[PDB]
From a paper:
Here, we focus on the ectoine hydroxylase, the enzyme that forms (4S,5S)-2-methyl-5-hydroxy-1,4,5,6-tetrahydropyrimidine-4-carboxylic acid from the precursor ectoine through a region-selective and stereospecific hydroxylation reaction. The EctD-mediated hydroxylation of (4S)-ectoine to (4S,5S)-5-hydroxyectoine requires O2 and 2-oxoglutarate as co-substrates, thereby forming CO2, succinate, and 5-hydroxyectoine. The catalytically critical iron is coordinated by the side chains of a conserved H×D/E…H motive, the so-called 2-His-1-carboxylate facial triad.
In addition, the crystal structure of the EctD protein from the salt tolerant moderate halophile V. salexigens in its iron-free form was solved, thereby allowing for the first time an assessment of the structural consequences of the binding of the active-site iron on the overall fold of the ectoine hydroxylase. However, after analyzing the iron content of this strongly overproduced EctD enzyme preparation, it became apparent that most of the isolated proteins did not contain an iron molecule; the iron content of the EctD protein solution dropped to 0.1–0.2 mole iron per 1 mol of EctD, rendering the enzyme largely inactive. The cell constants and the space-group were identical to the structure of the iron-bound EctD, suggesting that the apo-EctD protein crystalized in a manner similar to that found in the iron bound form. After solving the new crystal structure of the EctD protein, it became apparent that the iron ligand was lacking, as evidenced by the missing pronounced electron density that is present in the iron-bound EctD crystal structure. Otherwise, the apo- and the iron-bound forms are almost identical, as indicated by the RMSD value of 0.34 Å over 280 Cα atoms. In the V. salexigens EctD protein, the iron ligand is bound via interaction with two histidine side-chains, His-146 and His-248, and the side-chain of Asp-148. Interestingly, in the apo-structure of EctD, two water molecules populate the iron-binding site formed by the 2-His-1-carboxylate facial triad. This keeps the side chains of the His-146, His-248 and Asp-148 in an orientation very similar to that observed in the iron-bound EctD crystal structure. Hence, the EctD apo-protein exists in a form that is pre-set to incorporate the iron catalyst.
Residue numbers in the entry:
A (entry chain A), B (entry chain A): 2 to 195, 211 to 296
Write the structure that this text describes.
Amino acid sequence: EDLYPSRQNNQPKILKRKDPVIYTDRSKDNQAPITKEQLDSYEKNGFLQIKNFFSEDEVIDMQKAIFELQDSIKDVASDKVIREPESNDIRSIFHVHQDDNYFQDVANDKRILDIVRHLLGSDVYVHQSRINYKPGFKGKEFDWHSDFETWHVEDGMPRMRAISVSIALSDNYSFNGPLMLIPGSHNYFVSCVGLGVPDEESLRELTRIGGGISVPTGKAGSVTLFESNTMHGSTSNITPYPRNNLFMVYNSVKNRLVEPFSGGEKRPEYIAVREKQPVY
Amino acid sequence: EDLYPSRQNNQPKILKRKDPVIYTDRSKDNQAPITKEQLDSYEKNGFLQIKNFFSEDEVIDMQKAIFELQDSIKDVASDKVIREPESNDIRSIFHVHQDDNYFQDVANDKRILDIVRHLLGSDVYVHQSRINYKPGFKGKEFDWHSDFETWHVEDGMPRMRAISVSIALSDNYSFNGPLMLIPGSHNYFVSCVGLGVPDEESLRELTRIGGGISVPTGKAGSVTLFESNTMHGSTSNITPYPRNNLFMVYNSVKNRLVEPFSGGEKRPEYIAVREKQPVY
């Protein structure tokens, strides 16, 4: 049963969300690790920024850890390690939540799990992880998209029951190509043409409904959580201020991947997790 | 005598500014139409934003006027009128300060003249004017540059004694590709390689000296004045919020153009004014 068909024709359409946003009853706000106000802001906007999530030592430790890993894998040949063609410089590393002990501990951090389990109303597992290295002046624009539309079409994610967690590992300014989100857009599924980038008309409609464009900013260490279907994008960075980050996607154990809704072949494990965690 | 050589080799260098910034004595701040604080902010940063420069009716009148002119010239064949190749839609119109009565009155507005004459310490004339039409989702990134470096090399402007005046005719947000400036950068001349875009190393050095990147924002009608040599640029606009503007450059009558410092041919009048205004 495909509740969110996309890329099946050349006519875009906006379909209504058929899933809860916050899956734990609001009568149980007292059990959450965040406030009623934070819960309401997530429900309404489709994302939540939390500043001072980590202590200053934890921030510095994480920043050192990404560059220590980058140096440690300089000679590695792996499809998980994305390199710039000309320099061979490492731009991204996938699947660190599983492959490295330090990043596994970050991915299992109770402060993160307590939130995502509350919001998703179940236990969770990591769908994907990635470290991004984005030096000053690097990283092209990313057109607006819903992660969900890709997870669904290409990876077989059935329902809107996953949350992305972005840890800023550089200071996040308005001017260096920050993540931008359309508030409220998680309530609307944009079918895309027969890739996965919505048309301008749909984007205008979402922006009108949301009242604008949201651009969280903050010091290194700040955390942005965003719902699976929240529309987001970024401009290029023409400034010397980098944009390094650690990205993890938490999916409900009740929403495990099936075959790609496109009818196509599975993507690699490092892109979309199909491991079911063993008893031992 | 070339005080600011550029594009003559392939080694960039930073040369010191050899001209005043504010050409009227600071002992005469009382004669200016702006405050000591505004004067100091211009001197330090190389730009000044003024919100509520125009009354609300004047803002609405100017917005209507750009689109009335755009419609009036739909069938025109002119090198002053810049059109998108595919749609033929009008993206810019040069030389309105001279060619249209309404835009001439804007260019002669006493509120603008009183400021630029104070800052340039002399009478002024308009070097260039342009209306830009930048609908939602349109207008590519503009790499960092100093207008002065172009005016000098290509148009024969001798010294740093011109000011650009940008009137926002759309709301100016942080997220839709606003003008960004490097504060303090007007004090440093970046020679460019043998076009006119400075190298990353120089840009890092300016940004370090300035302490960051400045991005004025404000409602339609807000005015940004910037010194001839202030480094500025913008990202692309991936949002539906337009960026229409009226841009005028005021040059001191003591700094009239000579032959291009490149040794090349003059550009057209609509790009760089060489008319000396007649007595009648």
